[PDB]
Amino acid sequence: CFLFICDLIRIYHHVLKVPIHESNMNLHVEPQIFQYELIDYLIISYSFDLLEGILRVLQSHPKQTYMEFFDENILKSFEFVYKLALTISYKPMVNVIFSAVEVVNIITSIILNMDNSSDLKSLISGSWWRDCITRLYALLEKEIKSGDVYNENVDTTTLHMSKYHDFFGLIRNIGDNELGGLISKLIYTDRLQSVPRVISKEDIGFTAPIIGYKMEKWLLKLKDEVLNIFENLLMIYGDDATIVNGEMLIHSSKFLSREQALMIERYVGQDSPNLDLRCHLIEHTLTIIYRLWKDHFKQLREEQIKQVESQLIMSLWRFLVCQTETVTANEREMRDHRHLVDSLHDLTIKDQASYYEDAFEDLPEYIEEELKMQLNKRTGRIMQVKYDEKFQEMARTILESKSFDLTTLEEADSLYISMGL
């Protein structure tokens, strides 16, 4: 079934290969038909969803029984359809990107969780790796902005989830499913037919950009998954290889630095629900930097650290600035600050405390004592001052560490004075 879906998608070839831009005379005069587009968008999306389903049920199959599934043709067919999915010169369908990276997640996960990883990695050519990782880098170097999700804009920077493919999907309910009534109206329902019932294409389409916020929530989970499989493949190759090669200092450091800098510039005080996960991205890719630094220093070349010398040390300093502890120091004003920025999590925790938790009633004055610590450290982690001390220590034990001359001692004090110290 898996190889059938892979060569099925290489049959349904031209869907993920619509070009970046139309011509100057590529007219939008058209019958404005949507039915064939709906057919093959559902074909492609359900196909990749099925690939994801095959691999999670294959994951559920035990840790002795994979070589029956895996041979070279698995990897070759998926490598073609993966380059087809995370495209470069064509318009990307974000739906299939979710599935395609979740596939690689399941792959690397079972590579970690089997004993005979050697037969699988010996089946694997490193070309498959270094062709996957480039598309992962180009994916992670994109941006997430609510006001132009459902706009059609510049490519390869905005995972934008186009209006003409907006439904749920088989595993997750990725959008609003504006198209579900159109799936119902795909057929005449009183008749036996094979030709589709009509969908004029632009009848679809101002009330709430909460749709944009939840789509941002999906995309933040997506970039979390990208750095998660980066973490997973590093734990696969504890040893060094073609792909454990230092570029996960560069690209992950660029991501960490940008999602800290314009976090501080743009987000703290924007009271969208996505702030906490967007600043959990940096919290997790800090550890992705950290254990790459500590446990994988052997390949970390002298040239590439100088390729990223500014952003790495500056990203560490944006945690080492938080050891000052001159904002919080109490309880009183911090809850005013979480009225300022973290009223949305207040709504969340009041809805959970009022409906959806057994332990959240008749609180015996030890368990809201937990709340008046954890909401406050959470809203501090939003407010970008007062991270956790363990994350501050992990940022400290890279810059201060003498494994590499990041700073000299007469340059480090120039950063210590930028807090005091």
Binding site: P31, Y36, P196, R258, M314
Partner: protein
């Protein structure tokens, strides 16, 4: 983020303020600035290299001072940029060598050698001498300007201090180059104000400007203005006139950078230099510089970062120039401001306020007396508020809205090139035409056909660019509507041509320069081609070689000959080329033969190089320093065909040749036969429109030799022509037509003539092969049938009728297409519908639906069950999709909800929609069901889609069509716009107003039955769609009126079937004229 809110000037200055405090060598400052610049670069979606490359010529210019010290700062800068040092060094060495050479003696030139050659110390001397061999002009600029030293000996000191290979003392004096003057004029390093430092280095750059060949090697000091005497300026004036053309052609080469790795800092100092040189130049120089200085700052205007300086250089251009000229280059002003105002900040808003109130302040003769389109555009957008700015000119613009014959100047200014001004022209057309529609008195006098043909052939031209312009032009001619041929025309050789007589060669060449100067030489692109422009107008005035030794306009006055030759010289040309009467530019001695008689490039290329070699061969054999035709060797994509006609008239010179003239004639004619061998090869557009256009161009020079041959017989018979032989040159004339009369592959000649447009002469060269043939012969029938399909192209239905009745008698089902147009269409129609009733044959069924269409049995078309069945129509619409494409229009002009709805939602189920017309009628039908669902914005969406379809896919040009053939387009677009704006109606007052000016449309339609019927039946379809009650009153009266015109044109079955719907709604006048159709036909009694 402070820099993030800054536009160009403040943006650049603050980027400098970013990087210098980055280079303030604090470690925390260093790392934070690198981080912020990289994030700023990625959120601006640029690399840091191209981000900072606007100021990197400014930035490391001072690093060139202390590059012996600031190697660490330069190292941080290059690792910030990510490149190597040499990668930016070789391209930004233009701006460090200035302040590396003339500075202190312990040079960083040794270190730029050390980086310029890194792996080798092979020869640092040749490294030095070749980068200075590339860039040694620039140190002439710095040494004469940046520290003002003049002495040639200290110049040689700064040469040979570091350049020992710089031999022969001083190497070849290339310092009088136009490129050298164009790079020395680049120190108008101004400010927002004028410093005393700005004044003194302005006088310094004036001194280094005036320092040239008069004391080149003869040095005086020229560090002071005092040696600028009152004698040397005139030789300086004409020498600078010789410079300026090469100067801003160098500027044009600079700003049209094919390298594209450079920045706009060169462009900004180009704007500085242009501003400076128009500060300092006389009237003769500043008007010899007129044409593509404008195109240079159009290129400046287009870019996102060199606006404000180009706007103030507009402003000083307005300052330093009067109003007699300058008309031809200021359309760009009103075009750019009226098409792009919505971006502009307060800075650009109040400086363009300064522009406009300057223009209405001192230049009212140009604005409100010479170019009234500028006035009408500026007040036709009063959104910018110019009446609120000044207000006193309200009486003047009220008079100018009255006092313009505005249609011909629409036709003139609409013939421009770039999108902006013509978009503004048709926007003026749009607002002016809806205004004339409201005031009910637009003049359709026996002209508006000029401006509609201008719109038509511009939309013909834009078939591959700016579909939005095509759409807006389409809706403009939808607003112009129909303009029936019945009292109107469609305006579209010039004079008898020869070679001998002097005054006719003068008139000939002045018509030549009139044709080639004002469209084509006011807008070219190649700097060598504008030098060629100057060269050809220079040799034209060498042929009329006056005003170069003693003649001026009335300063000389001494002979009325050039007074006559200047008054017959046109006033537009008098404006544009009077400062070039003393042109001093000289060509080069021409090259080898580059041999000929290749049919391979004639096949595969043609007009690219073979037609060019064709021209160059026959001119280098043609004149050879006898005519202006000698100099045209350096134009060789529009520079051809026209010239291609007039180049090949060189046959007159011989009776006994002794010369390769008949050789090259027979050679090019057998090359044309090698063209004639070609039959489409089973190949795509690279055959079937490229070689087709080759056929068309060589076909064009064919019909020119037709035209010139007959007019070159008429010209020698104007006075008298019975002297016929004219001493053997008439025998040469009939020898030319003897060759051309043997040059008739009449099969293939007429074949390719019929294959291209060429309708009437394709018919004529069928006519001559009906003359010379066996009359009863097998080869006649194909040249009957393509003759009748080209008469379907010709549109003369009765010429078609005469052809189908004159020996076209094959089958009986071929002979019953004549009563089709011989007044008896009913027997023809039911013959075709019993022919095609089995619904399997393509031909009979297509002509069934088409002949059923062509006399308006449209209810029977829509009720015809060739598409209606137990299901809908045929899915995957076959090769007989013209069944659909003739049915959807009848379904439009007689409509309902349900049949239109289910049938166009059947036809949407196609996978592809390859025909243009089915998509046209589809989208007008989907607009109709959208307003059945009552959504007028989506209705206008599909109406504008249909506008896009016709503007991009339907429109043919002028010169080819009496607009009977256009009626199928302009009829539908008139109906579509009439549908459109009262789709965009609000209430009944608006509705009755819309129908009243629709009655004005029914006034201006004339009385052509098929468009009459079509437009008001479309109106009928819409107000029976709309079930509103005044829509029903309008319905009843339009049923009545189409019954009236159907009575007037005497086909009163459709009068009955329309007139019923107002008979049953109690209209006794409709009863009376039902009674009159019955009285008309046969039925006196009832």
């Amino acid at each position: 983020q402070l820099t993030l809110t800054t536009s160009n000037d403040v943006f650049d200055t603050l980027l400098l303020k970013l990087i210098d405090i980055f280079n303030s060598d604090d470690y925390s400052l260093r790392i934070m600035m690198t981080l912020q610049i990289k994030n700023m670069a990625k959120i601006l979606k640029k690399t840091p290299y191209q981000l900072l490359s606007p100021i990197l010529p400014v930035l490391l210019r001072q690093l060139g001072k202390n590059l012996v010290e600031r190697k660490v700062g330069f190292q941080n800068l290059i690792e910030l940029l990510g490149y190597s040092s040499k990668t930016i060094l070789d391209i930004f060495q233009r701006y460090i060598i200035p302040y590396a050479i003339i500075q202190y003696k312990s040079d960083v030139l040794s270190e730029i050698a050390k980086i310029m050659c890194d792996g080798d110390t092979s020869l640092i001397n040749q490294m030095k001498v070749n980068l200075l061999k590339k860039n040694s002009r620039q140190i002439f600029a710095v040494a004469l300007v940046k520290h003002g030293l003049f002495s040639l000996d200290i110049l040689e000191t700064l040469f040979l201090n570091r350049a020992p290979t710089f031999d022969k003392g001083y190497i070849t004096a290339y310092l009088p180059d136009y490129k050298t003057l164009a790079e020395i004029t680049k120190l108008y390093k101004n400010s927002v104000t004028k410093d005393a430092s700005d004044s003194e280095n302005a006088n310094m750059i004036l001194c280094s400007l005036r320092f040239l060949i008069t004391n080149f090697e003869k040095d005086s000091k020229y560090k002071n203005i005092n040696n600028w005497t009152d004698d040397q300026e005139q030789a300086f004036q004409k020498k600078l006139q010789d410079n300026i053309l090469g100067i801003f052609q160098v500027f044009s080469s600079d700003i049209h950078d094919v390298e594209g790795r450079t920045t706009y800092y060169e462009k900004l100092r180009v704007i500085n230099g242009i501003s400076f040189l128009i500060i300092y130049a006389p009237k003769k120089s500043i008007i010899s510089a007129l044409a593509q200085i404008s195109i240079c700052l159009q290129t400046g205007l287009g870019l996102k970062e060199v606006r404000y300086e180009a706007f103030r250089c507009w402003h000083l251009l307005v300052r330093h120039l009067n109003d007699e000229e300058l008309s031809t280059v200021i359309d760009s002003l009103i075009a750019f401001i009226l098409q792009k105002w919505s971006e502009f900040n307060g800075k650009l808003r109040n400086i363009v306020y300064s522009i406009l109130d300057t223009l209405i302040k001192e230049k009212s003769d140009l604005i409100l007396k010479l170019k009234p389109y500028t006035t009408l555009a500026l007040v036709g957008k009063p959104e910018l508020g110019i009446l609120a700015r000044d207000g006193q000119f309200a009486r003047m613009v009220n008079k100018i809205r009255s006092t313009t014959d505005l249609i011909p100047i629409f036709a003139n200014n609409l013939k421009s090139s770039n999108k902006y001004v013509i978009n503004q022209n048709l926007d003026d057309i749009e607002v002016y035409l809806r205004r004339k529609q409201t005031e009910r008195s637009i003049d359709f006098t026996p002209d508006i056909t000029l401006v509609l043909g201008a719109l038509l052939d511009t939309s013909h031209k834009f078939r591959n660019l700016d579909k939005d312009l095509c759409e807006k032009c389409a809706k403009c001619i939808s607003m112009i509507g129909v303009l029936d041929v019945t009292k109107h025309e469609f305006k579209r050789e010039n004079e008898v041509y020869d070679l001998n007589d002097s005054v006719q060669t003068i008139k000939f060449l002045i018509w030549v320069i009139n044709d080639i100067l004002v469209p084509a030489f006011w807008q070219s692109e190649n700097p060598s081609k504008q030098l060629f422009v100057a060269l050809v107008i220079q040799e034209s005035l060498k042929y009329c070689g006056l005003s170069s030794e003693s003649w001026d306009m009335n300063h000389k006055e001494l002979y009325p000959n050039e007074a006559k030759l200047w008054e017959k010289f046109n006033s537009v040309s008098k404006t544009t080329i009077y400062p070039l009467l003393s042109s001093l530019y000289l060509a080069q001695s021409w090259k080898e033969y580059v041999p000929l008689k290749y049919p391979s490039n004639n096949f595969k290329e043609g007009y690219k190089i073979w037609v060019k070699r064709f021209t160059l061969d026959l001119l280098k054999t043609g004149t050879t320093e006898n005519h202006p035709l000698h100099v045209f060797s350096s134009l060789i994509g529009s520079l051809s065909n026209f010239l291609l006609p007039y180049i090949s008239l060189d046959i007159i010179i011989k009776a006994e040749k002794g010369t390769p003239y008949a050789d090259i004639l027979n050679g090019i004619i057998i090359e044309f036969d090698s063209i004639f061998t070609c039959n489409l090869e089973g190949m795509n557009n690279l055959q079937v429109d490229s070689l087709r256009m080759c056929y068309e161009s060589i076909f064009r020079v064919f019909e020119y030799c037709k035209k010139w041959a007959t007019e070159f017989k008429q010209n020698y018979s104007k006075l008298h022509g019975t002297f016929i032989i004219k001493d053997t040159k008439t025998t040469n004339m009939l020898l030319r037509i003897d060759e051309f009369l043997r040059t008739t592959p009449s099969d293939l000649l007429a074949q390719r003539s019929l294959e291209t447009d060429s309708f009437e002469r394709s018919a004529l060269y069928l006519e001559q092969c009906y003359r010379q043939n066996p009359h009863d012969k097998n080869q006649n029938g194909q040249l009957l049938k393509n003759l009748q399909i080209t008469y379907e192209e010709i549109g003369d239905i009765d010429s078609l009728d005469g052809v189908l009745r004159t020996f076209a008698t094959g089958n009986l089902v071929s002979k019953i297409e004549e009563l089709q147009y011989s007044e008896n269409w009913k027997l023809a129609q039911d013959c075709f519908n019993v022919l095609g009733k089995f619904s399997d044959d393509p031909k009979t069924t297509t002509r069934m639906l088409k002949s059923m269409y062509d006399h308006q049995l449209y209810s029977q078309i829509i009720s015809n069950s060739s598409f209606h069945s137990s299901d809908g129509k045929i899915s995957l619409s076959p090769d007989v999709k013209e069944w659909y494409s003739i049915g959807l229009e009848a379904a439009n002009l007689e409509g309902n909800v349900q049949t239109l709805k289910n049938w166009v939602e059947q036809i949407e189920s196609l996978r592809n929609i390859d025909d243009r017309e089915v998509l046209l009628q589809y989208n007008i039908a989907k607009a109709l069901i959208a307003i059945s669902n009552e959504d007028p914005l989506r209705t206008q969406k599909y109406i504008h889609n249909s506008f896009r379809l016709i503007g991009t896919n339907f429109i043919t040009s002028s010169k080819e069509t009496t607009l009977l053939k256009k009626q199928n387009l302009l009829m539908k677009l008139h109906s579509l716009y009439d549908l459109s704006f009262l789709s965009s109606a609000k209430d009944k007052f608006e509705y009755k107003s819309n129908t009243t000016i629709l009655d004005y449309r029914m006034e201006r339609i004339g009385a052509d039955f098929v468009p009459n019927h079509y437009i008001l039946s479309m109106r009928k379809s819409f107000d029976q769609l709309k079930m509103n009650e005044q829509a029903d009153a309008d319905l009843g009266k339009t049923f009545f009126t189409l019954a009236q015109l159907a009575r007037n044109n005497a086909r009163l079955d459709i009068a009955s079937e329309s007139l019923m719907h107002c008979l049953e709604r109690r209209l006794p006048q409709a009863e009376l004229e039902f009674a009159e159709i019955l009285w008309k036909q046969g039925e006196n009694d009832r």
